XYZ file of N, CA and C in Angstrom:
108
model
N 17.295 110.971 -182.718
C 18.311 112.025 -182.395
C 19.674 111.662 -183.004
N 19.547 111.651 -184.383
C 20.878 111.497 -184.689
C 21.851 112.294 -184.781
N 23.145 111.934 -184.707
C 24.292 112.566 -183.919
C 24.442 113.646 -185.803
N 25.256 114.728 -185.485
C 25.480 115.649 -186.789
C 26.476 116.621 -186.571
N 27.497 116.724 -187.552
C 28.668 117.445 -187.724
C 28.708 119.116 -187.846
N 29.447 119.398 -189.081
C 29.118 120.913 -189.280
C 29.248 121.709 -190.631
N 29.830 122.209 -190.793
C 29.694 122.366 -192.277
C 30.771 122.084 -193.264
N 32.326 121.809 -192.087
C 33.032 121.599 -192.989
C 33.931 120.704 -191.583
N 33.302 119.526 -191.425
C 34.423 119.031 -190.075
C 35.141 117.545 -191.017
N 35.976 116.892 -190.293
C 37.235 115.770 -190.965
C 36.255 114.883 -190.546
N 36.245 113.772 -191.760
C 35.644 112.246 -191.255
C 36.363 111.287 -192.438
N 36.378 109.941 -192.259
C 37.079 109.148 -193.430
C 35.940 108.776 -194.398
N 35.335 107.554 -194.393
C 34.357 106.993 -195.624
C 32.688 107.479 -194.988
N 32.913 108.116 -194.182
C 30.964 108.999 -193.469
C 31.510 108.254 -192.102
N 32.525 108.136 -191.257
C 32.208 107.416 -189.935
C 31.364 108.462 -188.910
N 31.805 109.605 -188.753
C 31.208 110.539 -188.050
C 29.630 111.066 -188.274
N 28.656 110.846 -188.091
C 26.867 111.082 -188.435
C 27.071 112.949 -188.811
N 27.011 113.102 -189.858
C 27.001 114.512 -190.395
C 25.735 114.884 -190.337
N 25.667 115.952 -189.950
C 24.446 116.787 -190.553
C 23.084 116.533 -191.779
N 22.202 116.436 -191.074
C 21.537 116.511 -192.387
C 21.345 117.481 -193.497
N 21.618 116.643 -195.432
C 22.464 117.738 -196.154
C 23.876 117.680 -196.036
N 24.178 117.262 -195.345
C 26.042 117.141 -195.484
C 26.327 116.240 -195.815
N 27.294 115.855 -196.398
C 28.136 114.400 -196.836
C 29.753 114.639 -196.898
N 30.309 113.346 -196.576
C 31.285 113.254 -195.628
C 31.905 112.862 -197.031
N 33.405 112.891 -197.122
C 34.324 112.628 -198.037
C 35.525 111.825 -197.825
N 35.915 110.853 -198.246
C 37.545 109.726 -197.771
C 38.839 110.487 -198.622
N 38.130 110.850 -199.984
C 39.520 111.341 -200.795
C 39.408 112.805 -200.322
N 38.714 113.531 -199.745
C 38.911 114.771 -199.243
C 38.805 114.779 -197.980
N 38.523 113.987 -196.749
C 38.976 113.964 -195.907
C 38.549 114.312 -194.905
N 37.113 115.217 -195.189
C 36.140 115.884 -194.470
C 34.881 115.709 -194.866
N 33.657 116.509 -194.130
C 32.188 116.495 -194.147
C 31.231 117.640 -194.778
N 30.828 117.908 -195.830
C 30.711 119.614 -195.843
C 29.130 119.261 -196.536
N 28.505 120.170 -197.143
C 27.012 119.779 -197.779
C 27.587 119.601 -199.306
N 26.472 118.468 -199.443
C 26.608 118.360 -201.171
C 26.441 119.377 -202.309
N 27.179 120.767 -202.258
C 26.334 121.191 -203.043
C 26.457 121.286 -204.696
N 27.907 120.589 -204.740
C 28.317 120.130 -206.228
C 27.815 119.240 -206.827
């Protein structure tokens, strides 16, 4: 049961367990899906 964010929530280097499909960003500052 791992813990998961949302589609666009704030985290620093991934501390917050995002969503699966999402990835978290330090120079942007948030969590959103990879889709770039």
């Amino acid at each position: 049961d791992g813990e998961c964010g949302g589609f666009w929530w704030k985290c620093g280097r991934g501390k917050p367990p995002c969503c699966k499909g999402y990835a978290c960003s330090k120079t942007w500052g948030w969590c959103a899906v990879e889709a770039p």
